[PDB]
Design a protein around this motif. Structure first.
Motif, PDB file in Angstrom:
ATOM      1  N   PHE A  23       0.691  -0.556  -0.361  1.00 22.38           N
ATOM      2  CA  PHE A  23       0.196  -0.571   0.321  1.00 22.38           C
ATOM      3  C   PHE A  23       0.890   1.017   0.106  1.00 22.38           C
ATOM      4  O   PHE A  23       1.896   1.328   0.456  1.00 22.38           O
ATOM      5  N   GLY A  24       0.429   1.851  -0.551  1.00 23.67           N
ATOM      6  CA  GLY A  24       1.436   3.043  -0.773  1.00 23.67           C
ATOM      7  C   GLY A  24       2.254   3.125  -2.004  1.00 23.67           C
ATOM      8  O   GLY A  24       3.084   2.547  -2.861  1.00 23.67           O
ATOM      9  N   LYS A  25       2.736   3.938  -2.965  1.00 25.66           N
ATOM     10  CA  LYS A  25       3.759   4.038  -3.811  1.00 25.66           C
ATOM     11  C   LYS A  25       5.635   4.106  -2.950  1.00 25.66           C
ATOM     12  O   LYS A  25       5.675   4.249  -2.116  1.00 25.66           O
ATOM     13  N   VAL A  26       6.088   3.274  -3.745  1.00 23.18           N
ATOM     14  CA  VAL A  26       7.633   2.845  -3.155  1.00 23.18           C
ATOM     15  C   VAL A  26       7.932   4.132  -3.118  1.00 23.18           C
ATOM     16  O   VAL A  26       8.143   4.809  -4.051  1.00 23.18           O
ATOM     17  N   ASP A  27       9.145   4.477  -2.556  1.00 22.71           N
ATOM     18  CA  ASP A  27      10.154   4.947  -2.269  1.00 22.71           C
ATOM     19  C   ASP A  27      11.426   4.636  -2.023  1.00 22.71           C
ATOM     20  O   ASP A  27      11.885   4.361  -0.960  1.00 22.71           O
ATOM     21  N   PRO A  28      11.889   3.784  -3.178  1.00 24.30           N
ATOM     22  CA  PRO A  28      12.768   3.531  -3.275  1.00 24.30           C
ATOM     23  C   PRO A  28      14.625   3.707  -3.044  1.00 24.30           C
ATOM     24  O   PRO A  28      14.178   4.266  -3.334  1.00 24.30           O
ATOM     25  N   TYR A  29      15.209   2.725  -2.354  1.00 24.79           N
ATOM     26  CA  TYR A  29      16.377   3.021  -2.331  1.00 24.79           C
ATOM     27  C   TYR A  29      17.448   1.396  -2.409  1.00 24.79           C
ATOM     28  O   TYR A  29      16.430   0.236  -2.451  1.00 24.79           O
ATOM     29  N   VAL A  30      18.702   1.202  -2.476  1.00 27.36           N
ATOM     30  CA  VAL A  30      19.120   0.249  -2.531  1.00 27.36           C
ATOM     31  C   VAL A  30      19.601  -0.527  -1.342  1.00 27.36           C
ATOM     32  O   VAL A  30      21.094   1.006  -0.949  1.00 27.36           O
ATOM     33  N   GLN A  31      20.683  -1.148  -0.772  1.00 25.50           N
ATOM     34  CA  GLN A  31      21.462  -1.626   0.042  1.00 25.50           C
ATOM     35  C   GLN A  31      22.323  -2.945  -0.882  1.00 25.50           C
ATOM     36  O   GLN A  31      21.761  -3.625  -1.445  1.00 25.50           O
TER      37      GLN A  31
END
Length: 131
Positions: A23-31
């Motif tokens: 739920f909600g639009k993703v706010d992505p980062y990469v680890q």
């Protein structure tokens, strides 16, 4: 005083991510994880085609450990949820060989495409110029 071997990794962008993780639009980062070494990109707000264009220099301090790349949904209230990954064995790369390619991501939620990620990976020595 660089490590004997270093993974130089450019995390360029990911294409066709899930636009919503639950739920909600993703706010992505990469680890990026290599053993107990972990580092991360900045968070891109509400994008399914995020462009980080970020370069890392990760010293190989554990020669056994896989190289794990995870795409994570940042949430400033609750938990950050992982939603895509790719795993490499260190032996998949040759020293001095810049590998520039698009990889299919694996989804944490089966039944969902996870898209693709553009990475440039260059395993190098000390004093070998990155890329």
């Amino acid at each position: 005083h660089h490590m004997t071997l270093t993974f130089n990794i450019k995390v360029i962008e990911a294409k066709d991510l899930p636009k919503v993780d639950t739920f909600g639009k993703v706010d992505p980062y990469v680890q990026i994880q290599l053993g107990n070494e972990k580092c991360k990109t900045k968070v891109i707000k509400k994008s399914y085609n995020p462009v980080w264009n970020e370069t890392f220099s990760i010293p190989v301090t554990n020669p056994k450990a896989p190289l794990n790349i995870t795409v994570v949904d940042y949430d400033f209230i609750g938990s950050n949820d992982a939603f895509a990954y790719i795993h490499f064995n260190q032996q998949e790369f040759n020293v001095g060989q810049v590998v520039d390619k698009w990889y299919m991501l694996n989804s944490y939620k089966a039944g969902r495409s996870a898209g693709q990620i553009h990475l440039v990976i260059h395993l190098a020595t000390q004093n070998m110029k990155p890329f």
